[PDB]
């Protein structure tokens, strides 16, 4: 059991530990425990979650939790504060004052309340004055973009991006482009126009996309299309149908997405696990939505693309056990039409579909059923679930009679199993065991009907796996593949090449290779879906060194394996990933006797991997990655991840793999890719950024994004990784451009980069450990942060400068000595709080570093040029000073002749 009470303390403590993500969750979760008979026990909480939320930028929340607390006590200065603090952030300074103001007089003195009000004051002033300044900025383009009045595409387009830029650029500008809904009908018009260029339309959706990231605005959007609520919810979803190009659909879905995020106060990209109360509040809308996205899971009128979407849309927002809606939805979804009907799809194909479907439509339904599975937890549940997939398998099977028509059913019950196997595999394998399936397997497998012929050779190819208990139906099935293999019908031949390729120890390991080879290689002739398997096959023949070498050995197999991805898209991910991931050895394995003789395979061990990775990344290998990379897979990502990570460890390579959407991908990977996915993808990011110019790799704010990762990847500093590769990055990042360092800082990441300094046997990881900080304090924020305070910093920018038994560590803390000197308060914290200061100043004085005896003589010269109690000090050091005064090469006499200057 658990008590309302204590649980809070758990969060209270979290708030203090700095896990607001936790705190938020803990409080909210705690809040659930109590009720409306434990009065005071609650308000306290709203107040506190609001604290954390405010800390995690959940402003709309902070505010709502805040006010939810005042609900009890008018006073609650704690609340009024946070609220106004939040409100002012939502760009709404108005009542931001009346809270902060009222707060102040409740807690008469409070450097905080005051600090805010000072701000809010300068705020309400530049309010009306400034809003009607934007409003115009807006209405001026609202003409160009929408309201007719604009000439030539180009401009109408630009005028849009602006609204978009201006839209998300500030919580304010958003409300500004929203123009109180004016935006909706204008965007809808671009949608409804048949001719309007796609991009135009997409861009205009993306403006709206953003606008509705606001729960209230969004929740308005949903209901705003018809007096009858339910009807409106239809309209929104069904927007993705108006048109039907890849992007138009995609860009649209997000709109639907927002509706979820808004409805249950959740956001998967922020890790904002839904507030149980909100969802529960406006629950009625969450019903209507799913219901609709579900009912269109089958409407034959609903396109394919759109279909695939309502599935992912379904996936991402229903699985409570994963960034989803609260618990309980996923259940009533299987307890009713949902599951069954989500299965009804699992048994469809592009060659027999009761409602539009595409080659890709499977993946989406696999993983999606796989998660609906996982998102079940309870036994009482898992039961009611299998006691359904089963109630399905029955009705479906007991209808597979042998006859022209009935045969349809075997294709269904068949595919229905090829999926169920790729998805919730357990419920799937635990299905082909009731061999009542194996006969039909044969029946069709031997008939004349090329289809049943092939999709039977695939209902097995898709049952290979690992263990047994299922090698029952495999027993007879493998041979069958051998027979079907002979077939002249390519489709049935290939679909047989797999499995018979996916086993191993006519079927020679090489044989099966030369097969998928010409099978594939044969571009112009053999179709695409044919080679989708030829790719899958070869893929299994890539876990053996020998073959790996053979593959890459032939250009045409790369030039084409690429060309395929550049067309098959997310249909060759799991596969082409394992091909690109295995020839690079991107896979990691845990690390009297012997067995070292077998760990050989020189084609695997040694820089023989590089041989491959080289001419491999030569033949696309990257363009191919970005290609079949769009796929909420998880592992496929993780695959292209290591396929990149292990691609950017060769220098001259990343020189182009950067120009081939490199930075983009592994970056996307950061968010999308699961587990090691992000992890290994980020290392790729960091291990790409180094001997690379940040101007030609991280422009357009690409930078700002490339921080949360390699500033969270540093955290793991107990040892390992490319923490160092992550330094030459933040070093080549915080360097040119302020804003950059801004994040690096806001990252709450300094407590760690501040230790690549505190090292001994780590010369290298310290070399940049400093070169970074030079470009970090390189512009206030952290400059005034390192001087005034009184935290033993300056103590080292001086030692390191002199302590040059190596170098670098100097040149870094040297120009980090000269520029930190020009500040007066600096010359203070030192001299008085820097014992044996001369001795140090002495070494660095002319220390044979033909550089530090210039950055030292400057960070030394200016220590006296400012403040005279220091200008005095001529004890021992003032000697060397005179030194440089001849034709002794090293121009270090520069900051040298400057040291003397401070004598006047």
């Amino acid at each position: 059991v658990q008590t309302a009470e204590e649980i809070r303390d758990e969060g209270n403590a979290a708030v203090k530990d700095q896990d607001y993500i936790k705190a938020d969750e803990l409080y909210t979760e705690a809040l659930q425990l109590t009720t409306d008979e434990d009065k005071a026990l609650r308000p306290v909480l709203y107040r506190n979650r609001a604290m954390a939320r405010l800390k995690r930028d959940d402003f709309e929340g902070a505010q709502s939790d805040c006010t939810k607390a005042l609900e009890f006590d008018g006073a609650d200065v704690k609340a009024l504060f946070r609220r106004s603090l939040a409100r002012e952030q939502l760009g709404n300074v108005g009542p931001a004052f009346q809270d902060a103001k009222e707060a102040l007089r409740l807690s008469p003195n409070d450097k905080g309340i005051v600090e805010v009000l000072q701000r809010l004051v300068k705020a309400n002033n530049d309010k009306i004055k400034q809003t009607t300044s934007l409003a115009n900025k807006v209405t001026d383009m609202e003409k160009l973009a929408f309201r007719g009045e604009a000439k030539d595409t180009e401009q109408k387009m630009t005028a849009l991006n602006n609204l978009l830029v201006l839209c998300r650029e500030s919580e304010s500008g958003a409300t500004g482009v929203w123009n109180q809904g004016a935006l909706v009908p204008f965007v809808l018009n671009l949608i409804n126009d048949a001719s309007e260029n796609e991009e135009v339309t997409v861009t205009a959706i993306r403006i709206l996309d953003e606008t509705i990231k606001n729960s209230v605005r969004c929740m308005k959007f949903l209901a705003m299309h018809d007096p009858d609520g339910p009807k409106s919810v239809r309209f929104v979803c069904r927007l993705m149908c108006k048109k039907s190009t890849k992007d138009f659909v995609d860009a649209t879905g997000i709109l639907v997405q927002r509706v979820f995020n808004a409805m249950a106060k959740m956001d998967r990209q922020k890790e904002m696990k839904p507030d149980p109360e909100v969802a529960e509040a406006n629950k009625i809308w969450i019903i209507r939505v799913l219901l609709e996205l579900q009912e269109m899971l089958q409407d034959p009128k609903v396109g394919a693309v759109q279909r695939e979407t309502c599935i992912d849309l379904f996936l991402k927002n229903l699985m409570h056990m994963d960034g989803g809606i609260p618990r309980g939805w996923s259940w009533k979804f299987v307890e009713e039409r949902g599951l069954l009907a989500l299965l009804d799809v699992a048994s469809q194909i592009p060659e027999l579909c009761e409602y539009p479907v595409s080659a890709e439509t499977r993946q989406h339904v696999a993983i999606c059923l796989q998660r609906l599975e996982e998102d079940m937890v309870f036994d009482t549940k898992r039961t009611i679930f299998k006691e359904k997939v089963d109630m399905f398998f029955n009705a479906l099977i007991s209808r597979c009679t042998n006859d022209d028509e009935g045969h349809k059913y075997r294709i269904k019950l068949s595919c229905f199993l090829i999926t169920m196997l790729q998805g919730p595999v357990d419920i799937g394998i635990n299905l082909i065991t009731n061999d009542q399936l194996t006969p039909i397997m044969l029946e069709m497998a031997a008939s004349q009907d090329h289809l049943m012929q092939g999709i039977a050779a695939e209902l097995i190819v898709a049952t290979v796996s690992k263990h047994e208990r299922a090698i029952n139906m495999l027993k007879v099935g493998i041979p069958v593949l051998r027979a079907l293999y002979d077939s002249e019908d390519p489709t049935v031949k290939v679909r047989a090449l797999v499995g018979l390729c996916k086993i191993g120890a006519e079927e020679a390991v090489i044989s099966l290779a030369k097969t998928c080879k010409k099978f594939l290689l044969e571009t112009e002739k053999y179709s695409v879906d044919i080679r989708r398997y030829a790719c899958e096959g070869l893929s299994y023949l890539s876990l053996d060194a020998d073959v790996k070498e053979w593959i890459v050995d032939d250009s045409l197999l790369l030039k084409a394996l690429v060309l395929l991805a550049k067309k098959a898209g997310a249909l060759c991910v799991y596969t082409l990933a394992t091909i690109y991931a295995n020839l690079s050895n991107a896979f990691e394995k845990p690390k009297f006797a012997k067995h070292h003789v077998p760990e050989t395979h020189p084609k695997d061990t040694e820089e023989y991997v590089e041989k491959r990775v080289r001419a491999l990344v030569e033949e696309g290998a990257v363009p191919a990655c970005v290609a079949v990379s769009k796929t909420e897979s998880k592992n496929a990502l993780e695959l292209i991840a290591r396929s990149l990570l292990a691609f950017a460890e060769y220098e001259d390579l990343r020189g182009r793999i950067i120009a081939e959407g490199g930075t983009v991908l592994c970056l996307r990977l950061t968010k999308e890719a699961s587990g090691e996915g992000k992890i290994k993808a980020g290392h790729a990011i960091a291990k790409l950024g180094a001997k690379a110019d940040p101007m030609i790799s991280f422009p357009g704010q690409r930078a700002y994004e490339v921080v949360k990762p390699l500033c969270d990847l540093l955290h793991p500093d107990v040892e390992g990784k490319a923490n160092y590769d992550s330094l030459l990055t933040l070093t080549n990042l915080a360097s040119v451009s302020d804003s950059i360092r801004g994040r690096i800082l806001k990252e709450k990441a300094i407590p760690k980069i501040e230790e690549f300094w505190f090292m001994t046997d780590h010369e290298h990881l310290r070399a940049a450990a400093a070169e970074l900080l030079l470009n970090l304090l390189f512009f206030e924020k952290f400059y005034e942060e390192t001087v005034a305070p009184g935290t033993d910093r300056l103590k080292l920018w001086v030692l390191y400068s002199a302590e040059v038994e190596e170098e670098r560590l100097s040149r870094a803390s040297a120009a980090g000595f000269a520029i930190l000197t020009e500040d007066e308060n600096a010359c203070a914290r030192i001299m008085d709080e820097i014992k044996s200061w001369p001795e140090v100043f002495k070494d660095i004085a002319m220390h044979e570093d033909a550089e530090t005896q210039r950055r030292g003589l400057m960070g030394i010269a200016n220590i006296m040029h400012s403040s005279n109690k220091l200008c005095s000090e001529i004890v021992s050091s003032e000697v060397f000073r005179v030194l440089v005064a001849v034709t002794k090469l090293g121009t270090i006499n520069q900051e040298r002749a400057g040291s003397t200057e401070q004598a006047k």
Binding site: G11, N12, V77
Partner: peptide, 10 residues
Amino acid sequence: AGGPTIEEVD
């Protein structure tokens, strides 16, 4: 010094 500077919960 402390934390009652309402940067603390309760």
